[PDB]
């Protein structure tokens, strides 16, 4: 079955670099074990060297930003005509799962306290704004929490007073 | 307004490689009919390429396989030297693998010898080690992964000479310890040899293809 035959295999990232062309058999392309191949061009670049396990990828981000979690890393068997260590065929994957911990504590939101008294009106003639405010300290949040909503409300007030002309 | 066209194709290059596949190319010029004053140009490509196939494989230099298992520590004409001050010699083996098609041979000693004592199945006093480093979450991707750390009863190796004058070799060679002893020690929570403890791993991620996991998080 014909395949695209590439002249160099980039280690560390698995890409097929330097296209020599297509419409040639896998056996002919891999006469030079320094070459690499890709079929249908969807992906999966396999070097023509004998099969050997690749390098462990970098640890994936922890599954949660909170408390103990779990993170993976992969390793692919890359090559052609043979097997990797483990009676494994080329293309298979092997995983290692590890317990991770980005931060110790975790955001626990708090609760609003009682409403403060209404402040006076923002103006002494015509119409203005009235504001009341509360605190996020019943209970206070730990780590990165915050109370749900706003810490202050505003509303219009009418003084019933005309301004000096 | 003069129309250019191509001239004869030149000589094709020979197959630049001696193994596997290579590439050749022919060079033509737009010299016989020339494009004057900038009107039309030469249509096409001034270079064709073609693959040439040498039917002979490339050399592949053999690489060293990993070291084998240390052989049993013995001494000539004395049978088992276990739990005794008798230095022996054990050997290890490598295999040169992958050499094909006149490739270079592996470079180095395929064997490795070292002097040793034998503590195979010897009863030794022991002491409980501290808590080892938390291992990997196993089985990875399987149902309910769990970690494991452990304290094991480490043997107290006997104070034997680590530097011995070999009379047959006339050298002062180092001597290390080989074998699985039987460590004696007070029990640690109903156990005499090893006591471990497991803890489940939390929020396990599913195992998908590294391309597929990349395209899944990008799409959400
Ligand atoms: C054990 O001895 C080695 C070197 O001596 C021997 O090694 C054996 C494996 C065997 O092949 C035998 O024939 C050979 O004679 C010591 O290596 C030395 O270590 C010191 C300090 O660690 C270094 O400064 C030296 O460069 C290094 N090499 C030499 C040639 O001296 C090794 O330290 C020793 N181990 C112990 C625990 O004593
Ligand atoms: C990663 O960063 C952390 C700081 C949190 O913001 C995580 O969000 C989630 O927060 C709630 C608390 O409201 C916890 O119960 C969750 O466990 C945590 O996932 C965020 O993912
Ligand atoms: C409170 O009492 C009112 C009767 C006014 O005297 C107010 O002063 C007025 O404020 C407006 C804008 O706030 C200004 O345009 C006027 O010039 C000023 O007379 C007072 O604050
Ligand atoms: C021609 O004869 C062969 C028997 C090999 O010795 C060839 O060596 C190979 O040459 C190509 C480039 O021309 C390299 O890609 C290979 O790494 C090399 O083994 C020789 O050229
Ligand atoms: C991953 O694991 C170890 C390093 O952590 C090595 O055996 C190798 O680098 C592998 O890719
Ligand atoms: C995970 O582990 C260490 C960092 O904790 C590094 O080897 C690397 O970042 C890997 O992804
Ligand atoms: C304060 O605001 C409302 C109650 O008024 C709720 O979202 C919650 O109790 C918060 O603490
Ligand atoms: C202030 O607003 C109302 C009462 O006016 C309630 O949602 C609550 O008591 C809050 O503290
Ligand atoms: C403002 O509104 C009334 C009094 O006008 C009360 O609910 C409270 O004092 C609030 O602060
Ligand atoms: C040169 O190349 C081809 C003929 O080989 C045509 O496209 C055209 O004649 C051009 O001049
Ligand atoms: C080169 O290629 C072919 C001959 O191989 C012809 O189309 C023509 O001679 C061109 O110059
Ligand atoms: C054997 O010796 C060491 C490991 O003990 C390494 O140099 C290498 O893995 C070799 O095969
Ligand atoms: C021989 O030495 C020890 C076992 O005593 C290990 O490093 C390994 O098994 C090697 O083959
Ligand atoms: C076993 O090992 C030593 C004694 O040999 C102590 O750490 C303790 O008694 C443990 O049970
Ligand atoms: C393991 O447990 C704790 C540390 O987690 C200590 O008591 C000691 O290091 C033991 O080995
Ligand atoms: C496992 O747990 C933590 C690290 O995750 C440490 O207490 C220690 O490394 C232990 O082996």
Numbering used by the authors:
A (entry chain A): 28 to 192
B (entry chain B): 255 to 474
Text lifted from the article:
The point of convergence is the cleavage of the 186 kDa complement component 3 (C3) generating the C3b fragment (178 kDa) which becomes covalently associated with the activator surface. The C3bBb complex is the AP C3 convertase, which catalyzes further C3 cleavage. In contrast, properdin (FP) is a direct positive regulator of the AP and stabilizes the convertase by associating with C3b in the convertase and proconvertase, reviewed. FP oligomerizes prior to secretion, and in plasma it is found in a mass distribution with roughly 25% tetramers, 50% trimers and 25% dimers.
Whereas, the disulfide bridge pattern in six thrombospondin repeats were those expected, the three cysteine bridges 32–56, 43–73, and 57–75 in the N-terminal TB domain differed from those annotated in UNIPROT. We therefore confirmed the disulfide bridge pattern by two orthogonal techniques. First, an anomalous Fourier map calculated from data collected at λ = 2.48 Å confirmed the three disulfide bridges. The deduced disulfide bridge pattern and a homology search conducted with a preliminary model of FPcΔ3 showed that residues 28–76 folds into a TGFβ binding (TB) domain and not a truncated thrombospondin repeat as earlier proposed. In summary, comprehensive structural data and mass spectrometry analysis demonstrated for the first time that FP residues 28–76 fold into a TB domain.
